[PDB]
Amino acid sequence: LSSVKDFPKIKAIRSFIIGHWLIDSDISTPASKWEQYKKSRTSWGINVLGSFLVEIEATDGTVGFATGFGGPPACWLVHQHFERFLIGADPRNTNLLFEQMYRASMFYGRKGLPIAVISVIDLALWDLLGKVRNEPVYRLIGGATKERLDFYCTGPEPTAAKAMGFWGGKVPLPFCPDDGHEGLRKNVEFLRKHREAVGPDFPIMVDCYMSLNVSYTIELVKACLDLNINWWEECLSPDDTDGFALIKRAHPTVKFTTGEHEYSRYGFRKLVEGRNLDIIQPDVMWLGGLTELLKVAALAAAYDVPVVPHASGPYSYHFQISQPNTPFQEYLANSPDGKSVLPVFGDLFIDEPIPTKGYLTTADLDKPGFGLTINPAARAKLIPSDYLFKV
Amino acid sequence: LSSVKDFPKIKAIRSFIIGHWLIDSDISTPASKWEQYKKSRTSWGINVLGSFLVEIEATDGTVGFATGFGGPPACWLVHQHFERFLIGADPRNTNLLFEQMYRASMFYGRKGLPIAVISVIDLALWDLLGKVRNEPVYRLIGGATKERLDFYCTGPEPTAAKAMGFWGGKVPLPFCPDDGHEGLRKNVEFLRKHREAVGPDFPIMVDCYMSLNVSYTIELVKACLDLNINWWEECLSPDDTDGFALIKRAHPTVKFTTGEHEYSRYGFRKLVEGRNLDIIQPDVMWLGGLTELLKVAALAAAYDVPVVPHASGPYSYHFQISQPNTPFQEYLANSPDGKSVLPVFGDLFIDEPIPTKGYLTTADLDKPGFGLTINPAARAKLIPSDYLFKV
Amino acid sequence: SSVKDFPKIKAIRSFIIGHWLIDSDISTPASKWEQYKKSRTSWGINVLGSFLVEIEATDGTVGFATGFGGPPACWLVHQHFERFLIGADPRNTNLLFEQMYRASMFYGRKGLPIAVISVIDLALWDLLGKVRNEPVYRLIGGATKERLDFYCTGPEPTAAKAMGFWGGKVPLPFCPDDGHEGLRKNVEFLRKHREAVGPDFPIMVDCYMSLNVSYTIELVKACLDLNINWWEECLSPDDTDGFALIKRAHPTVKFTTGEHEYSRYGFRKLVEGRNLDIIQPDVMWLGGLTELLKVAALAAAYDVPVVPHASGPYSYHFQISQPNTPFQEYLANSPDGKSVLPVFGDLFIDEPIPTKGYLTTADLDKPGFGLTINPAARAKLIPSDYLFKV
Amino acid sequence: LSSVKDFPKIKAIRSFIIGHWLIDSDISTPASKWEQYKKSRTSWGINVLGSFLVEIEATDGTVGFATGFGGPPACWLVHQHFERFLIGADPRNTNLLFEQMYRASMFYGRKGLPIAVISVIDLALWDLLGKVRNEPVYRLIGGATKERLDFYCTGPEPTAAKAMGFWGGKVPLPFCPDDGHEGLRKNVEFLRKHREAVGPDFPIMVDCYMSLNVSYTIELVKACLDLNINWWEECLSPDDTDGFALIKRAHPTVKFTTGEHEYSRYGFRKLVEGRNLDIIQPDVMWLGGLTELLKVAALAAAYDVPVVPHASGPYSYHFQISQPNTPFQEYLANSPDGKSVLPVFGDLFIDEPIPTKGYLTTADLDKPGFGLTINPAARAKLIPSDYLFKV
Amino acid sequence: EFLRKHREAVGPDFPIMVDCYMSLNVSYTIELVKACLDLNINWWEECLSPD
């Protein structure tokens, strides 16, 4: 109509493959049951997929983009499956586009890698919407509910996190249930040593990276009771969310969290049912994107379950600033020693906002879209997906 | 900072008081218990509150407005309580402004009248935001998930509704539980007559306006089984949603709906819990506004429960077009005979979209904000709320 | 020394393989939208393509299997999963599954990467049978029956009946967004089939994930005089909980699911509550034969029939071997749905096909899964090597 | 057919009867209620059945065999009942032969003695299968999931277990509920001694041989809370597995196990239902055989419940090495002192693998079938069962 | 520390109750009450929103 804005449609979509303690220190993993896969996270293939970037161009030549893990496979699906839904569409139709992509990929999807593809496309749409409107994304999804974003820090050195101004520190659990009682005692001593370094009052959380079981979790938490661990994250496989009832029966005054490896509003509904998890912790680059996360967050708020997303850079920041039920978030200490903070996406972007003092403000986010500009140095690192269709 | 759009803050807020079968025909109500209150709906005071209008003016002089039921005590609360949170605020801060207004009014609110005040402010905010942006509200809340909105019609003549091309007709139940087995027999014959008037194929739904109980509903539904009633609406008091389990135990192939007189995300979580309700039916002018409605809709979407909100003009149309789980919409045949459709806000606007052929399109909603302009003839009728503060 | 020295895995190779099913009226999750409801290809049911994995042992015995998954599946084979396989004893089926499942857990658990694991696992079992000169069914518990009885999936259950199949499964044409007209037309579609085949021939209805609880309850009510044998995949695999509500409404009516569910953890939910009369795993999709055997055993503790998706020999060797596996599906993949073609087309020369509606143990008495690649179709095998040329 | 192996069918079946602290020390039993059955385990008749051995012969002359408890009435049932199913059959038909035997014996079976007869026959089938193929049984049922079997040791001297190199020690509970509060404090002292003897780090488990009740268990466990007991085994009658819910309500951080006197996949589904048992512990010679234990393990694996079967020689070892959910197992200290480890079937076999250092490896199992060759010295002791059928 | 000082001022035996004026949540209530276990607080009042 000639009463309202003639918003640009989607013209073209392009995709690109992007060419220490995190892989080389002791971390308990689903694959730590086997001797040759426990010393190194790369050995069983944590870094297998790599990273990709999706650009979406509108008819006015505005380009929105986003990045995520998924790599070559992800890029293949962008063009082969999902592009048909996007070309010629109005980018403001985020509800319809998500549902179309989710429901059309349902026979091979619902969880896992196809939904990571969907997420990154969705984030690129939101980037595009911001950039057309000359507005930051957080201003399009409900405003700011706070002025300051508080952060906890994830890494092997919570003394560093404390020094930098983060309110809490998150350490990886080193040993898995297959290390037996000796591994359990060593886990206790690892955590004891961190509590003693930071003092009695600094929040310590423990990441268990999907690696434990019910019995082990119960035995481990019981042994650590005087350490005052703030929460225990991802104790069980995401296949066994039911086990949290049995953990809560044993430890009902202890906080437990999960959800980094769960997907869609249907996945997260089970996490909120029964109320056995104190925080749900979705990854916006993984679950379905920002449109779906907004639905996850509204479901959790109905039960007053905090949503504290996985460190996703600006993709999580705009979300966190905007919601009633989203109190703080994760930053990764992604320096080799774990003692300083570096940009989450490396030298891919120029203008990444970094919480050097353990926080960010709304002003830090006041750039169009998700506020990221590709480093024109690292444009040469962006390998086009063209070769994957050269059959 | 200067990278992004400089959005106008809220300058001023003004509030105004607005100065047949629906009241006079046989309708079963909560007050149908007692002899002098069952003949007329006005007698016990369905019309008691009256109507009010809220304007919100921005610093660039853009005005957004919304109307609702509430009248004089609603206007009182606008300025006495809720104005303080709003003046000087960014109108994009919808999440914040709601959470403040709700949690501040929690000592006398949560349900009912003060929440209706919050709804109208929120809707006026959305109107303003659409107007500044030169965009319809629906293009701001997720876009269009469909091109066409299909309408059923509420009133005493569903043959009329059939003739107008509405897909269904919703008739009100004439007789209450206290009219006994005679009243039930007359209820059955009432519904039987409508069925043979419209023939075997046309959807008929029955509105019980909060007025029945578990045993009576079960009896009435049983007696009407071969009349193929599509759904039974608001059979119980909103005080006893728990009875819907017992009703579903008796009649599990039969469709039951409720929610018109329920409020907040926390009210509606009950109704989605049992999955004993086939549709939930919030009133947007009543539940807390569009900002809260979107959250209710997201919770319901995780369970694939349809939200088909109350007939609220453009405020529900923009919502209905935008969601995955919002398949169709109510219109009320608010003519005296029930045989034509009238504008829902009467004289007040010049350009209400009305589905005179039983449907609306996205093109009908393609005007800035909620797309209503006040009729300048009716501007005499709106009386400033100043007098209510002259103590 | 006293025991056989079994060959270890030497190498792994992968290859991309280069109508009513796509162009008739079928209800689908994407039937919500006008542009995606006439065609099944439009929203991309055919998107992934097919792939084949060969596994070669140190003695030059080659095991293989094929599935859907195509180029991104191949990619995953060499990039992720090959590291667990080279140099391993192929008899270690339990260890190799657990490694592959738990290594891929951060991006896996359901969907595409599990389809990858499945085909790898099936190829391992092919190899194991081939080394031992034995059919797979003789390695996984023997024959519990002599005869596999088939039902037929397709739009012509009269053709099914005539061909010797014991039952016929039809696709539901219209979705819940077609409204009450769609429901009436659905009822009419099913009446026509009941009337054509007569009162005693079993018909079952494939709903392909497309419905919701309320619509399913209404539709099943309207068809009650038609004596539908079962209703298959009424809900999204995201909402298996809804079957409690459906069974509350219709406890005498049979409901099935499980085609698009994955792993022993996914399937346990479908057995809890016993709201599903049959579970229907896809062996090429769920995790493979190693995991299917575990799903089957779980189910058998509660006497739930497991009746797999049509997967050719990969399901036949399963179905013949288990106590709780009473029959299975064949897909009528001729264009008219009036005859039976091979499931994998022209890729193999020696597919067993139930032209008279059954198979025997004798039909399955070939080494491994009993499939031999057509050397005319070997030129269609595109090597996956182009996908790593970055 | 002519394309595959021509596999030998079963030609013949033979059965044979085989002609300290465990019977004479303080152990709590179900029969410890009464004075004259308290001091001696033989007095109420633990030894009453005796042992038997079944040989299965194929048409190529290959013989598989297995041994278990059951003795004369077991041998009776082999030929009277079960022989009819086996002669002429393919021994690869393990799935057929179990269901046939089980469902045909259902009228007097399901649990107990006839199921023991089923187990031994099935174990002799697997031995034959391994022997014909020239492969160990574990390489036929899933391969090795681990290189090492770790053992804990069961008997009255855990310091002996510790020294021999077993990772943990399981002691029998001396006194029953009918020994009163004095018996309770005696039980507590027993256990406090053993904790003192082995020190604070060494795993101690307690066998309660079906002998306790819910209230006793709850009181005894609470009284031993300082003694960090690893698990409490078979506290309840196998008839009262529902009581574990009540025990876990009192003691949710304590581990409890059972299963030794349970039978079939249907018996065990109950134990995994509700997840009130940390470990299930079937006896492979008792529950229905290897074919059925494979199905029990799979059921348990879906809920990540450890199966740690009763000590049954190579019959357990091949199973334990093969499965994802089977972390260690049991060896019994079957010396008179309880201070050394001896073959579980005594002098019957020449080559029984014994974990003298508290472990076994996959190399130890690398003999065809279950790896047991029968001692021709002990071949005189095998009484043929023919006398039982001379009426 | 607020509540410990009140326990100490009135001594061990006098009943003290805590009004939380609808202001807490489940996690914080559970944590707070745990932290105050030796204070023998008699009851905790309106910890949760009436919603």
PDB file of all heavy atoms in Angstrom, chain A residues 185-208:
ATOM      1  N   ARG A 185      37.699 -37.969  43.297  1.00  0.00           N
ATOM      2  CA  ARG A 185      38.527 -37.280  44.298  1.00  0.00           C
ATOM      3  C   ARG A 185      39.344 -36.135  43.683  1.00  0.00           C
ATOM      4  O   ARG A 185      39.531 -35.091  44.305  1.00  0.00           O
ATOM      5  CB  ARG A 185      39.461 -38.269  45.009  1.00  0.00           C
ATOM      6  CG  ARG A 185      38.778 -39.146  46.063  1.00  0.00           C
ATOM      7  CD  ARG A 185      39.787 -39.827  47.010  1.00  0.00           C
ATOM      8  NE  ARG A 185      40.699 -40.751  46.324  1.00  0.00           N
ATOM      9  CZ  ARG A 185      40.426 -42.024  46.030  1.00  0.00           C
ATOM     10  NH1 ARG A 185      39.253 -42.564  46.349  1.00  0.00           N
ATOM     11  NH2 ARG A 185      41.334 -42.765  45.403  1.00  0.00           N
ATOM     12  N   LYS A 186      39.813 -36.348  42.457  1.00  0.00           N
ATOM     13  CA  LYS A 186      40.600 -35.371  41.730  1.00  0.00           C
ATOM     14  C   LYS A 186      39.759 -34.184  41.264  1.00  0.00           C
ATOM     15  O   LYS A 186      40.249 -33.052  41.244  1.00  0.00           O
ATOM     16  CB  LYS A 186      41.283 -36.043  40.537  1.00  0.00           C
ATOM     17  CG  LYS A 186      42.728 -36.488  40.773  1.00  0.00           C
ATOM     18  CD  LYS A 186      43.023 -37.825  40.096  1.00  0.00           C
ATOM     19  CE  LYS A 186      43.508 -37.668  38.660  1.00  0.00           C
ATOM     20  NZ  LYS A 186      43.005 -38.756  37.756  1.00  0.00           N
ATOM     21  N   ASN A 187      38.499 -34.450  40.899  1.00  0.00           N
ATOM     22  CA  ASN A 187      37.493 -33.402  40.627  1.00  0.00           C
ATOM     23  C   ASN A 187      37.206 -32.524  41.838  1.00  0.00           C
ATOM     24  O   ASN A 187      37.223 -31.305  41.736  1.00  0.00           O
ATOM     25  CB  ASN A 187      36.167 -34.035  40.140  1.00  0.00           C
ATOM     26  CG  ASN A 187      36.198 -34.411  38.674  1.00  0.00           C
ATOM     27  OD1 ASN A 187      36.895 -33.781  37.882  1.00  0.00           O
ATOM     28  ND2 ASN A 187      35.425 -35.430  38.296  1.00  0.00           N
ATOM     29  N   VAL A 188      36.943 -33.159  42.977  1.00  0.00           N
ATOM     30  CA  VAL A 188      36.790 -32.469  44.260  1.00  0.00           C
ATOM     31  C   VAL A 188      37.980 -31.548  44.589  1.00  0.00           C
ATOM     32  O   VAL A 188      37.791 -30.395  44.970  1.00  0.00           O
ATOM     33  CB  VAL A 188      36.516 -33.483  45.401  1.00  0.00           C
ATOM     34  CG1 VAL A 188      36.513 -32.799  46.773  1.00  0.00           C
ATOM     35  CG2 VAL A 188      35.181 -34.189  45.164  1.00  0.00           C
ATOM     36  N   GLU A 189      39.196 -32.054  44.401  1.00  0.00           N
ATOM     37  CA  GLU A 189      40.410 -31.316  44.734  1.00  0.00           C
ATOM     38  C   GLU A 189      40.667 -30.140  43.785  1.00  0.00           C
ATOM     39  O   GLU A 189      41.048 -29.051  44.225  1.00  0.00           O
ATOM     40  CB  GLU A 189      41.611 -32.280  44.780  1.00  0.00           C
ATOM     41  CG  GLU A 189      42.981 -31.642  45.052  1.00  0.00           C
ATOM     42  CD  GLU A 189      43.189 -31.184  46.502  1.00  0.00           C
ATOM     43  OE1 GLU A 189      42.327 -31.434  47.381  1.00  0.00           O
ATOM     44  OE2 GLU A 189      44.244 -30.564  46.758  1.00  0.00           O
ATOM     45  N   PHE A 190      40.436 -30.371  42.494  1.00  0.00           N
ATOM     46  CA  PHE A 190      40.385 -29.315  41.470  1.00  0.00           C
ATOM     47  C   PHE A 190      39.476 -28.136  41.841  1.00  0.00           C
ATOM     48  O   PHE A 190      39.869 -26.982  41.674  1.00  0.00           O
ATOM     49  CB  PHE A 190      39.971 -29.937  40.133  1.00  0.00           C
ATOM     50  CG  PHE A 190      39.745 -28.956  39.026  1.00  0.00           C
ATOM     51  CD1 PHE A 190      40.796 -28.542  38.224  1.00  0.00           C
ATOM     52  CD2 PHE A 190      38.464 -28.482  38.748  1.00  0.00           C
ATOM     53  CE1 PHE A 190      40.586 -27.651  37.176  1.00  0.00           C
ATOM     54  CE2 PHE A 190      38.245 -27.590  37.711  1.00  0.00           C
ATOM     55  CZ  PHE A 190      39.305 -27.182  36.913  1.00  0.00           C
ATOM     56  N   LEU A 191      38.279 -28.436  42.347  1.00  0.00           N
ATOM     57  CA  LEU A 191      37.277 -27.420  42.652  1.00  0.00           C
ATOM     58  C   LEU A 191      37.576 -26.742  43.975  1.00  0.00           C
ATOM     59  O   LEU A 191      37.429 -25.524  44.098  1.00  0.00           O
ATOM     60  CB  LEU A 191      35.864 -28.025  42.676  1.00  0.00           C
ATOM     61  CG  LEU A 191      35.352 -28.591  41.348  1.00  0.00           C
ATOM     62  CD1 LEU A 191      34.043 -29.327  41.526  1.00  0.00           C
ATOM     63  CD2 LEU A 191      35.248 -27.508  40.291  1.00  0.00           C
ATOM     64  N   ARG A 192      38.000 -27.540  44.955  1.00  0.00           N
ATOM     65  CA  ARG A 192      38.502 -27.031  46.229  1.00  0.00           C
ATOM     66  C   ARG A 192      39.601 -25.989  46.045  1.00  0.00           C
ATOM     67  O   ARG A 192      39.571 -24.941  46.693  1.00  0.00           O
ATOM     68  CB  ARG A 192      38.982 -28.187  47.119  1.00  0.00           C
ATOM     69  CG  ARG A 192      39.275 -27.782  48.551  1.00  0.00           C
ATOM     70  CD  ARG A 192      40.151 -28.815  49.274  1.00  0.00           C
ATOM     71  NE  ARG A 192      41.491 -28.986  48.692  1.00  0.00           N
ATOM     72  CZ  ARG A 192      42.469 -28.074  48.705  1.00  0.00           C
ATOM     73  NH1 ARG A 192      42.289 -26.872  49.247  1.00  0.00           N
ATOM     74  NH2 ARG A 192      43.642 -28.361  48.149  1.00  0.00           N
ATOM     75  N   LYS A 193      40.537 -26.277  45.135  1.00  0.00           N
ATOM     76  CA  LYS A 193      41.687 -25.420  44.859  1.00  0.00           C
ATOM     77  C   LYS A 193      41.304 -24.092  44.229  1.00  0.00           C
ATOM     78  O   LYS A 193      41.981 -23.090  44.445  1.00  0.00           O
ATOM     79  CB  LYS A 193      42.685 -26.132  43.947  1.00  0.00           C
ATOM     80  CG  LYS A 193      43.713 -26.984  44.684  1.00  0.00           C
ATOM     81  CD  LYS A 193      45.086 -26.920  44.014  1.00  0.00           C
ATOM     82  CE  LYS A 193      45.265 -28.024  42.973  1.00  0.00           C
ATOM     83  NZ  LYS A 193      46.609 -27.988  42.321  1.00  0.00           N
ATOM     84  N   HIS A 194      40.224 -24.086  43.450  1.00  0.00           N
ATOM     85  CA  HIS A 194      39.704 -22.860  42.846  1.00  0.00           C
ATOM     86  C   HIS A 194      38.951 -21.998  43.842  1.00  0.00           C
ATOM     87  O   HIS A 194      39.060 -20.771  43.807  1.00  0.00           O
ATOM     88  CB  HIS A 194      38.790 -23.192  41.670  1.00  0.00           C
ATOM     89  CG  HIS A 194      39.521 -23.392  40.385  1.00  0.00           C
ATOM     90  ND1 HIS A 194      39.407 -24.541  39.634  1.00  0.00           N
ATOM     91  CD2 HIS A 194      40.397 -22.597  39.729  1.00  0.00           C
ATOM     92  CE1 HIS A 194      40.172 -24.438  38.563  1.00  0.00           C
ATOM     93  NE2 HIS A 194      40.779 -23.266  38.593  1.00  0.00           N
ATOM     94  N   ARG A 195      38.173 -22.638  44.711  1.00  0.00           N
ATOM     95  CA  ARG A 195      37.403 -21.932  45.743  1.00  0.00           C
ATOM     96  C   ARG A 195      38.357 -21.229  46.713  1.00  0.00           C
ATOM     97  O   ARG A 195      38.105 -20.104  47.160  1.00  0.00           O
ATOM     98  CB  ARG A 195      36.466 -22.918  46.462  1.00  0.00           C
ATOM     99  CG  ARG A 195      35.918 -22.517  47.860  1.00  0.00           C
ATOM    100  CD  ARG A 195      35.066 -21.229  47.852  1.00  0.00           C
ATOM    101  NE  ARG A 195      33.841 -21.335  47.061  1.00  0.00           N
ATOM    102  CZ  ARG A 195      33.391 -20.404  46.220  1.00  0.00           C
ATOM    103  NH1 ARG A 195      34.063 -19.275  46.034  1.00  0.00           N
ATOM    104  NH2 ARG A 195      32.260 -20.601  45.557  1.00  0.00           N
ATOM    105  N   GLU A 196      39.462 -21.899  47.005  1.00  0.00           N
ATOM    106  CA  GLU A 196      40.421 -21.413  47.966  1.00  0.00           C
ATOM    107  C   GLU A 196      41.209 -20.234  47.397  1.00  0.00           C
ATOM    108  O   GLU A 196      41.496 -19.281  48.115  1.00  0.00           O
ATOM    109  CB  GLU A 196      41.274 -22.584  48.453  1.00  0.00           C
ATOM    110  CG  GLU A 196      42.758 -22.385  48.551  1.00  0.00           C
ATOM    111  CD  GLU A 196      43.448 -23.678  48.927  1.00  0.00           C
ATOM    112  OE1 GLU A 196      43.086 -24.271  49.968  1.00  0.00           O
ATOM    113  OE2 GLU A 196      44.341 -24.109  48.173  1.00  0.00           O
ATOM    114  N   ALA A 197      41.478 -20.271  46.093  1.00  0.00           N
ATOM    115  CA  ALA A 197      42.095 -19.146  45.371  1.00  0.00           C
ATOM    116  C   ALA A 197      41.242 -17.862  45.266  1.00  0.00           C
ATOM    117  O   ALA A 197      41.764 -16.752  45.430  1.00  0.00           O
ATOM    118  CB  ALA A 197      42.569 -19.605  43.987  1.00  0.00           C
ATOM    119  N   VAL A 198      39.944 -18.006  44.993  1.00  0.00           N
ATOM    120  CA  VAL A 198      39.060 -16.844  44.794  1.00  0.00           C
ATOM    121  C   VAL A 198      38.421 -16.334  46.093  1.00  0.00           C
ATOM    122  O   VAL A 198      37.867 -15.237  46.131  1.00  0.00           O
ATOM    123  CB  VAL A 198      37.951 -17.113  43.739  1.00  0.00           C
ATOM    124  CG1 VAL A 198      38.552 -17.542  42.403  1.00  0.00           C
ATOM    125  CG2 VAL A 198      36.957 -18.151  44.248  1.00  0.00           C
ATOM    126  N   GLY A 199      38.510 -17.133  47.150  1.00  0.00           N
ATOM    127  CA  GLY A 199      37.866 -16.808  48.414  1.00  0.00           C
ATOM    128  C   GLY A 199      36.460 -17.373  48.496  1.00  0.00           C
ATOM    129  O   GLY A 199      35.977 -17.965  47.531  1.00  0.00           O
ATOM    130  N   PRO A 200      35.787 -17.191  49.650  1.00  0.00           N
ATOM    131  CA  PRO A 200      34.520 -17.869  49.937  1.00  0.00           C
ATOM    132  C   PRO A 200      33.282 -17.274  49.246  1.00  0.00           C
ATOM    133  O   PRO A 200      32.211 -17.886  49.273  1.00  0.00           O
ATOM    134  CB  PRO A 200      34.392 -17.735  51.454  1.00  0.00           C
ATOM    135  CG  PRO A 200      35.122 -16.476  51.782  1.00  0.00           C
ATOM    136  CD  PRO A 200      36.211 -16.316  50.761  1.00  0.00           C
ATOM    137  N   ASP A 201      33.420 -16.098  48.647  1.00  0.00           N
ATOM    138  CA  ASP A 201      32.258 -15.287  48.276  1.00  0.00           C
ATOM    139  C   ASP A 201      32.075 -15.139  46.764  1.00  0.00           C
ATOM    140  O   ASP A 201      30.977 -14.828  46.309  1.00  0.00           O
ATOM    141  CB  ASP A 201      32.327 -13.898  48.933  1.00  0.00           C
ATOM    142  CG  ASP A 201      31.962 -13.918  50.423  1.00  0.00           C
ATOM    143  OD1 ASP A 201      31.427 -14.931  50.928  1.00  0.00           O
ATOM    144  OD2 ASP A 201      32.211 -12.893  51.094  1.00  0.00           O
ATOM    145  N   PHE A 202      33.150 -15.346  46.004  1.00  0.00           N
ATOM    146  CA  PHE A 202      33.111 -15.309  44.542  1.00  0.00           C
ATOM    147  C   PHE A 202      32.358 -16.530  43.982  1.00  0.00           C
ATOM    148  O   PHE A 202      32.730 -17.672  44.261  1.00  0.00           O
ATOM    149  CB  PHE A 202      34.531 -15.227  43.983  1.00  0.00           C
ATOM    150  CG  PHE A 202      34.600 -14.874  42.518  1.00  0.00           C
ATOM    151  CD1 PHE A 202      34.217 -13.617  42.069  1.00  0.00           C
ATOM    152  CD2 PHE A 202      35.067 -15.801  41.594  1.00  0.00           C
ATOM    153  CE1 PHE A 202      34.274 -13.295  40.725  1.00  0.00           C
ATOM    154  CE2 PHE A 202      35.137 -15.484  40.236  1.00  0.00           C
ATOM    155  CZ  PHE A 202      34.746 -14.235  39.804  1.00  0.00           C
ATOM    156  N   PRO A 203      31.255 -16.289  43.244  1.00  0.00           N
ATOM    157  CA  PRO A 203      30.553 -17.331  42.492  1.00  0.00           C
ATOM    158  C   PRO A 203      31.435 -18.186  41.578  1.00  0.00           C
ATOM    159  O   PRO A 203      32.100 -17.668  40.682  1.00  0.00           O
ATOM    160  CB  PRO A 203      29.523 -16.537  41.688  1.00  0.00           C
ATOM    161  CG  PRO A 203      29.214 -15.395  42.560  1.00  0.00           C
ATOM    162  CD  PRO A 203      30.548 -15.001  43.143  1.00  0.00           C
ATOM    163  N   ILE A 204      31.426 -19.493  41.834  1.00  0.00           N
ATOM    164  CA  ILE A 204      32.000 -20.477  40.932  1.00  0.00           C
ATOM    165  C   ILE A 204      30.910 -21.407  40.416  1.00  0.00           C
ATOM    166  O   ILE A 204      30.133 -21.971  41.188  1.00  0.00           O
ATOM    167  CB  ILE A 204      33.125 -21.296  41.615  1.00  0.00           C
ATOM    168  CG1 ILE A 204      34.354 -20.412  41.830  1.00  0.00           C
ATOM    169  CG2 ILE A 204      33.523 -22.531  40.774  1.00  0.00           C
ATOM    170  CD1 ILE A 204      35.437 -21.096  42.619  1.00  0.00           C
ATOM    171  N   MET A 205      30.850 -21.537  39.099  1.00  0.00           N
ATOM    172  CA  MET A 205      29.975 -22.499  38.461  1.00  0.00           C
ATOM    173  C   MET A 205      30.860 -23.564  37.815  1.00  0.00           C
ATOM    174  O   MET A 205      32.036 -23.314  37.562  1.00  0.00           O
ATOM    175  CB  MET A 205      29.044 -21.810  37.447  1.00  0.00           C
ATOM    176  CG  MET A 205      29.401 -20.362  37.100  1.00  0.00           C
ATOM    177  SD  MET A 205      29.085 -19.023  38.508  1.00  0.00           S
ATOM    178  CE  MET A 205      28.412 -17.618  37.402  1.00  0.00           C
ATOM    179  N   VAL A 206      30.313 -24.761  37.607  1.00  0.00           N
ATOM    180  CA  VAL A 206      31.068 -25.877  37.031  1.00  0.00           C
ATOM    181  C   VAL A 206      30.375 -26.359  35.751  1.00  0.00           C
ATOM    182  O   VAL A 206      29.205 -26.750  35.788  1.00  0.00           O
ATOM    183  CB  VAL A 206      31.186 -27.069  38.019  1.00  0.00           C
ATOM    184  CG1 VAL A 206      32.009 -28.204  37.407  1.00  0.00           C
ATOM    185  CG2 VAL A 206      31.806 -26.630  39.321  1.00  0.00           C
ATOM    186  N   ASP A 207      31.092 -26.305  34.630  1.00  0.00           N
ATOM    187  CA  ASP A 207      30.617 -26.870  33.363  1.00  0.00           C
ATOM    188  C   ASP A 207      30.976 -28.343  33.303  1.00  0.00           C
ATOM    189  O   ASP A 207      32.137 -28.700  33.478  1.00  0.00           O
ATOM    190  CB  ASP A 207      31.238 -26.131  32.165  1.00  0.00           C
ATOM    191  CG  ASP A 207      30.504 -26.406  30.851  1.00  0.00           C
ATOM    192  OD1 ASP A 207      30.279 -27.582  30.503  1.00  0.00           O
ATOM    193  OD2 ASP A 207      30.162 -25.437  30.146  1.00  0.00           O
ATOM    194  N   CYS A 208      29.984 -29.196  33.035  1.00  0.00           N
ATOM    195  CA  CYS A 208      30.224 -30.638  33.024  1.00  0.00           C
ATOM    196  C   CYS A 208      30.127 -31.227  31.637  1.00  0.00           C
ATOM    197  O   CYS A 208      30.258 -32.438  31.476  1.00  0.00           O
ATOM    198  CB  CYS A 208      29.289 -31.367  33.996  1.00  0.00           C
ATOM    199  SG  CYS A 208      29.527 -30.855  35.740  1.00  0.00           S
TER     200      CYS A 208
END
